[PDB]
Amino acid sequence: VPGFGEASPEAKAAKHLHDFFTYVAVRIVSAQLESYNPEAYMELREFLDTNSVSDGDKFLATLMRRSSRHMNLALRILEVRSAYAKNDFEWDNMKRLAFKNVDDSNTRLMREYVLETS
Amino acid sequence: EASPEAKAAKHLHDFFTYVAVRIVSAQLESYNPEAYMELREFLDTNSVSDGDKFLATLMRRSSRHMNLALRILEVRSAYAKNDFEWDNMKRLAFKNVDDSNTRLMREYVL
């Protein structure tokens, strides 16, 4: 692919999805906690304040070194992010929406251009 | 209320704009030195991370910049539809998550 000689665009997108899935998993596990263990929901909420999901593996590595019970929370998120990605995430729907976004973007850019230059 | 799939799709749309600008820039370096230089200068004062805003600004800068913008738009759709290996990216996502799980585990107890 012209202009790429390190990571492929696929690998780049792949790493972004990985981190995105960590973030989904944290939102998932957080939800499940809110009336199954609000003591643990509060603690997760406290950890999120000072800890960023952005580099998700660094966030998880930090989370499981926080305490033994935080470590158990990390292991839950690891399991949930695996299950979500491999089982629930609608990959082909994602692809379809991206095509629609690109198609609609093309259309809108051209339409607004033509309209405003007249 | 935006779904994960939809959030992921918005990111991929902007990502494909980025890829298309990179592809187009590379081709211009080989096939049109002057146009390469105009794109590069435009790139010095306009962020591709702006996505469609960037394209809209490019379109209106001049007729030469409009040609750049139309080539980028064409390359963006053709790349995403014909060339980008969607199933490979997926296999790579799965592998990243598997390898990450294993490494996080190994490193915590070792």
Side-chain angles (χ1 to χ4, degrees), chain A residues 1-5 7-35 37-38 40-41 43-57 59-78 80-118, chain B residues 2-33 35-90 92-94 96-109:
Chain A
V1 184
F4 290 84
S8 65
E10 292 88 357
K12 291 159 122 66
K15 183 68 200 321
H16 179 70
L17 286 167
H18 175 235
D19 286 328
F20 186 58
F21 293 142
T22 302
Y23 149 90
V24 185
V26 168
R27 213 171 146 265
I28 289 182
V29 174
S30 177
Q32 288 173 16
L33 257 56
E34 200 177 343
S35 280
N37 193 348
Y41 165 81
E43 280 193 338
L44 176 63
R45 163 152 286 279
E46 197 132 59
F47 188 85
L48 267 163
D49 270 28
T50 58
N51 293 89
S52 64
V53 297
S54 291
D55 179 347
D57 284 4
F59 170 90
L60 289 171
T62 296
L63 182 64
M64 56 212 211
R65 281 161 181 72
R66 170 59 176 82
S67 89
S68 54
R69 80 209 171 271
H70 287 90
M71 189 271 192
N72 290 319
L73 200 50
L75 259 292
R76 174 67 191 153
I77 298 167
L78 286 176
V80 167
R81 101 192 155 156
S82 193
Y84 180 72
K86 287 162 169 189
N87 301 326
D88 300 335
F89 189 68
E90 293 160 12
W91 287 91
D92 266 284
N93 197 47
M94 171 191 61
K95 177 185 201 190
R96 188 185 65 82
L97 290 184
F99 278 174
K100 191 204 205 295
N101 282 340
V102 171
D103 288 347
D104 291 356
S105 157
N106 281 347
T107 294
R108 175 174 41 244
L109 282 163
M110 299 300 285
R111 182 180 61 244
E112 308 185 348
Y113 183 79
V114 167
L115 281 180
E116 87 168 56
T117 65
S118 313
Chain B
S3 73
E5 295 81 358
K7 279 180 191 171
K10 175 52 187 319
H11 198 257
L12 281 171
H13 163 203
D14 290 330
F15 175 66
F16 289 137
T17 300
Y18 171 71
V19 173
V21 169
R22 265 182 85 172
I23 287 166
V24 167
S25 191
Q27 304 282 44
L28 291 172
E29 209 178 349
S30 311
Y31 292 104
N32 195 336
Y36 169 78
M37 285 286 135
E38 294 210 84
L39 182 56
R40 203 190 179 171
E41 292 178 25
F42 187 86
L43 283 175
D44 287 329
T45 40
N46 297 271
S47 324
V48 190
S49 57
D50 273 350
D52 282 4
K53 295 161 276 164
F54 170 95
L55 293 177
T57 301
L58 183 59
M59 289 170 81
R60 296 160 173 73
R61 185 56 49 86
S62 78
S63 53
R64 279 159 7 257
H65 291 89
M66 172 65 77
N67 290 333
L68 291 174
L70 299 173
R71 182 53 58 222
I72 291 158
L73 285 169
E74 189 148 13
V75 168
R76 185 175 72 169
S77 291
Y79 179 75
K81 288 171 183 191
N82 304 327
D83 307 324
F84 189 71
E85 305 185 319
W86 287 87
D87 283 316
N88 280 128
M89 163 188 74
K90 183 181 184 180
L92 284 181
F94 280 173
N96 287 344
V97 185
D98 290 342
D99 291 350
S100 162
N101 283 346
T102 294
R103 191 180 30 247
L104 289 171
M105 285 321 291
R106 291 189 65 99
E107 300 181 348
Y108 175 83
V109 328

